[PDB]
From a paper:
Multi-subunit SMC complexes control chromosome superstructure and promote chromosome disjunction, conceivably by actively translocating along DNA double helices. The heads undergo ATP-dependent engagement and disengagement to drive SMC action on the chromosome. Here, we elucidate the architecture of prokaryotic Smc dimers by high-throughput cysteine cross-linking and crystallography.
The BsSmcCC2 monomer comprises two ∼120 residues long α helices (designated as αN1 and αC1), whose arrangement presents the knob-into-hole organization of a canonical coiled coil. In the middle of BsSmcCC2, residues of αN1 located in heptad positions “b,” “e,” and “f” are involved in the contact between the two coiled coils via charged and hydrophobic side chains. To establish whether the organization of the BsSmcCC2 dimer in the crystal is compatible with the cysteine cross-linking pattern described above, we mapped the cross-linking efficiency onto the BsSmcCC2 structure and plotted it against the corresponding Cα-Cα distances (respectively). The excellent agreement between the crystal structure and the in vivo cross-linking pattern implies that both datasets faithfully represent the architecture of Smc-ScpAB complexes in vivo.
Author numbering: 250 to 365, 808 to 924
The structure:
Amino acid sequence: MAKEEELAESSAISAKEAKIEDTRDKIQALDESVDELQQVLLVTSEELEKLEGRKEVLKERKKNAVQNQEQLEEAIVQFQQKETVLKEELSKQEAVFETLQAEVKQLRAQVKEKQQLSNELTELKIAAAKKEQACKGEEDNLARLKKELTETELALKEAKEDLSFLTSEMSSSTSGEEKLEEAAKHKLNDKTKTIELIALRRDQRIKLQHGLDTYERELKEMKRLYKQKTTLL
């Protein structure tokens, strides 16, 4: 009977040796659970800096577009500036044509008016073509002066060219900004939260791995005192 409950004490060794084999299977459930999470974190991390890179593309396209937008606004201002001058000048030079042919009609008449000697009236005939020719070209020069306004006013419709260009830097970016900045900030929270699971689960297992440190040593004596007493009797 004395030994009958010597071994009935060794039954607890089976409990501890079972609590071990039950506990080591509690840790590895998490050393691959974590492993599954580290393969998720890998994926989540890839999407962010792919997205964060895609966000950098529009920054290259606009800052290249801004150099194209501010450039055309200069042209838009420069062309309207020339157009205001040419249309003023053409009108100003058109006035010379008006004053031109007003002097020529009086010239032919006045020289003929005195004629109603004659050489002094033909001295106006010389003054006729003198006034006529000096103001014949100005009637034709301002005509071609309008041709520079036939190029500028149309160039102002190459300013509309910027707006058409711009809306492809907007609705391609604005539809892209809601496609990038919405997702890029949203893809991050999944990344950080996955790291927090791992950090906890790793800490959750080290508390059992420290539990295992005690449990695995307690057996070495349980199996020694029993072994040293088994050699006694």
